[PDB]
Amino acid sequence: MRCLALDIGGTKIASAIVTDGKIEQRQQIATPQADAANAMHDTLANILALYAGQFDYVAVASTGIINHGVLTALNPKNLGGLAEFPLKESIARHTDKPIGLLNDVQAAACAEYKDEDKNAVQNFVFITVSTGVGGGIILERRLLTEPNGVAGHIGHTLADPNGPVCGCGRVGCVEAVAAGRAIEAVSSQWNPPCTPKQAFELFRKNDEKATALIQRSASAIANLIADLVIGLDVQKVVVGGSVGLAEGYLPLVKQYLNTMPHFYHCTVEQARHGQDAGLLGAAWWVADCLK
Amino acid sequence: MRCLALDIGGTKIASAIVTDGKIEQRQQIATPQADAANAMHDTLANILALYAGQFDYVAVASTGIINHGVLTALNPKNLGGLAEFPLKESIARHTDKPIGLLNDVQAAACAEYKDEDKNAVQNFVFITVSTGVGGGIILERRLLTEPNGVAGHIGHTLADPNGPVCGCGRVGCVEAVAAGRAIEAVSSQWNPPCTPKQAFELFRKNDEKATALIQRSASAIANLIADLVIGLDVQKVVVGGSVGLAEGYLPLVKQYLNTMPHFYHCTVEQARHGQDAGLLGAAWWVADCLKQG
Ligand SMILES: Nc1ncnc2c1ncn2[C@@H]1O[C@H](COP(=O)(O)OP(=O)(O)NP(=O)(O)O)[C@@H](O)[C@H]1O
Ligand SMILES: Nc1ncnc2c1ncn2[C@@H]1O[C@H](COP(=O)(O)OP(=O)(O)NP(=O)(O)O)[C@@H](O)[C@H]1O
Ligand SMILES: [Ca+2]
Numbered sequence: 126m127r128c129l130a131l132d133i134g135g136t137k138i139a140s141a142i143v144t145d146g147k148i149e150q151r152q153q154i155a156t157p158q159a160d161a162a163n164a165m166h167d168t169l170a171n172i173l174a175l176y177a178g179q180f181d182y183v184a185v186a187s188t189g190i191i192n193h194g195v196l197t198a199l200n201p202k203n204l205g206g207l208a209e210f211p212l213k214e215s216i217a218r219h220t221d222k223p224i225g226l227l228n229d230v231q232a233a234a235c236a237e238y239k240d241e242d243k244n245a246v247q248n249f250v251f252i253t254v255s256t257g258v259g260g261g262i263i264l265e266r267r268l269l270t271e272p273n274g275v276a277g278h279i280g281h282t283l284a285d286p287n288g289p290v291c292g293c294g295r296v297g298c299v300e301a302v303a304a305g306r307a308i309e310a311v312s313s314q315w316n317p318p319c320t321p322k323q324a325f326e327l328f329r330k331n332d333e334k335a336t337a338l339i340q341r342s343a344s345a346i347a348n349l350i351a352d353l354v355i356g357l358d359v360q361k362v363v364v365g366g367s368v369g370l371a372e373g374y375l376p377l378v379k380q381y382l383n384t385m386p387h388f389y390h391c392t393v394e395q396a397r398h399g400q401d402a403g404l405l406g407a408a409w410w411v412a413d414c415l416k
Numbered sequence: 417m418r419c420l421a422l423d424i425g426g427t428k429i430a431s432a433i434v435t436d437g438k439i440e441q442r443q444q445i446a447t448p449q450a451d452a453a454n455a456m457h458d459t460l461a462n463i464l465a466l467y468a469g470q471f472d473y474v475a476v477a478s479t480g481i482i483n484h485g486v487l488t489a490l491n492p493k494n495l496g497g498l499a500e501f502p503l504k505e506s507i508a509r510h511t512d513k514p515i516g517l518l519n520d521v522q523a524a525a526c527a528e529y530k531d532e533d534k535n536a537v538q539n540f541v542f543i544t545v546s547t548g549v550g551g552g553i554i555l556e557r558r559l560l561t562e563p564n565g566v567a568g569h570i571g572h573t574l575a576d577p578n579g580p581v582c583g584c585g586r587v588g589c590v591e592a593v594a595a596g597r598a599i600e601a602v603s604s605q606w607n608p609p610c611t612p613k614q615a616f617e618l619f620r621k622n623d624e625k626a627t628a629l630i631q632r633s634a635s636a637i638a639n640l641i642a643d644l645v646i647g648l649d650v651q652k653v654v655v656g657g658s659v660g661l662a663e664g665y666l667p668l669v670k671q672y673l674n675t676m677p678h679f680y681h682c683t684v685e686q687a688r689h690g691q692d693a694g695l696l697g698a699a700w701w702v703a704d705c706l707k708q709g
């Protein structure tokens with residue numbers, strides 16, 4: 126089985142042929158910005174032309190949310206002119222092969238799951254801690270996507286009812302205390318201002334104020350993991366993203382989790398398949414669906 | 417298809433034959449307490465004898481957690497001498513029909529799900545707010561039970577990192593803020609003391625302090641529901657239990673939910689299938705499993 130894999134980001138669109146889990150014929154173009162909706166139809170037509178005849182099926186990872194083949198988001202304004210873009214339908218204009226679509230964090234989850242021991246790990250969660258917090262959830266070896274592609278938005282679960290307000294209005298979500306954006310909202314008000322990377326450097330040098338800020342984030346992620354373990358019987362959590370992978374961060378997450386009662390514990394590890402995670406994860410998931 | 421359905425509670429064991437969702441041949445006995453483990457083996461022998469020949473399969477609802485056919489609990493204290501009791505193996509000594517096991521809140525979830533429109537509702541959560549807070553979760557029309565029977569323990573998810581400590585050790589759980597026990601922990605300290613039922617009566621008369629206590633619980637349940645909607649794409653939540661069904665309670669829950677952004681909203685209704693929920697839910701679920709493999 127040969128997969129035409131597409132990874133549609135906010136800035137770049139990567140395409141490739143994936144066969145036996147191997148990438149070949151990479152290609153990267155800019156995500157349409159001018160007249161984006163009209164342009165995207167052209168871009169997709171051109172990609173499907175370039176690889177014509179070379180694929181048995183198409184797998185699309187995209188930022189945002191895939192709702193019944195349509196590209197959307199919690200705030201569809203963050204997509205600009207691609208809000209509500211009919212993604213599956215436009216691809217289907219140019220091919221009769223089956224097309225699967227999922228979002229980018231879901232695809233990254235599948236990239237980190239595909240090489241797990243699936244006898245031993247059937248309930249699995251990928252959390253990216255980056256500019257924001259996103260997730261992908263796999264239960265009984267299957268990724269959650271139904272009915273509307275929302276499952277996995279665990280960055281919008283509650284971290285503290287007295288915490289900061291999150292982007293779209295919920296008071297106290299994980300995103301507003303744990304994400305890189307939430308770290309910077311505090312560190313940029315320091316005299317003088319610091320970025321999250323600078324706050325981390327100070328944390329690793331035992332700066333107590335920087336440490337408190339990084340702990341605020343790590344503690345929120347630890348409590349989210351505990352919620353997933355006790356709520357869903359999750360067995361393993363893989364953490365990625367530039368904050369999630371920062372030196373010292375995951376060890377702090379695990380220290381907070383370990384001081385909870387042992388039945389909140391699970392395997393917690395850093396992401397190790399970030400390279401081409403969207404492409405490889407989408408190809409694996411769509412092939413798995415085909416069974 | 418004929419189901420021998422058992423509902424093993426803290427104090428009573430109910431049994432019955434369930435055929436096409438109809439109950440017949442009820443028996444109800446006391447849950448063994450003296451020499452519980454030894455006695456339970458006898459009780460199960462006796463029940464399977466009484467019903468011998470009358471069932472194609474066995475469905476068991478039990479309090480606590482079913483881990484690979486064994487009765488356990490987050491803290492095995494509240495199981496007494498039935499802690500780690502080999503429930504499936506013990507029943508299998510007396511029958512070769514198939515035996516399915518699930519916990520009591522999971523069974524109540526299935527009782528409330530079985531008459532939903534399965535086309536329109538595939539992700540469904542049942543929450544019982546009573547002495548404690550329990551849940552049962554159904555995703556893509558299937559109850560979550562693997563691998564170790566823990567799925568659905570949403571009373572132990574976080575409500576407030578500065579809230580009270582939960583019974584089994586976690587700081588700030590939903591249960592320690594929302595359950596009947598948590599309400600009474602505060603209202604028993606009033607001068608003079610009140611039970612939760614009395615606190616609710618005062619809340620309905622607009623006592624601001626009692627109202628504050630009830631809102632603490634309702635807001636915590638509303639935030640849990642919001643977590644389930646955004647985290648799991650849950651479409652419908654059904655709320656039961658003596659606190660959950662108390663007059664005024666669910667409207668308050670829904671009022672808190674409705675002030676959040678629209679994408680946290682879902683259908684929220686009161687439980688309506690509480691009667692024989694254990695028996696009927698277990699019977700339906702085990703049949704559903706058998707149909708699908
Ligand atoms: N080495 C680093 N250590 C800690 N935080 C970092 C580091 N690098 C970047 N960040 C922060 O992590 C967040 C995203 O970083 P970055 O990866 O550079 O942006 P991006 O990749 O374009 N967006 P995203 O898809 O979320 O990763 C921001 O809050 C950064 O300040
Ligand atoms: N009408 C009521 N309104 C509000 N709270 C109530 C009411 N009745 C009982 N409660 C409280 O809810 C909890 C359980 O009440 P009750 O149902 O009588 O015991 P139970 O049957 O053992 N419940 P449970 O074991 O949790 O399924 C206790 O906290 C009660 O104080
Ligand atoms: Ca929000």
Ligand SMILES: [Ca+2]
Nearest residue numbers: 582584585586
């Ligand atoms: Ca606990």
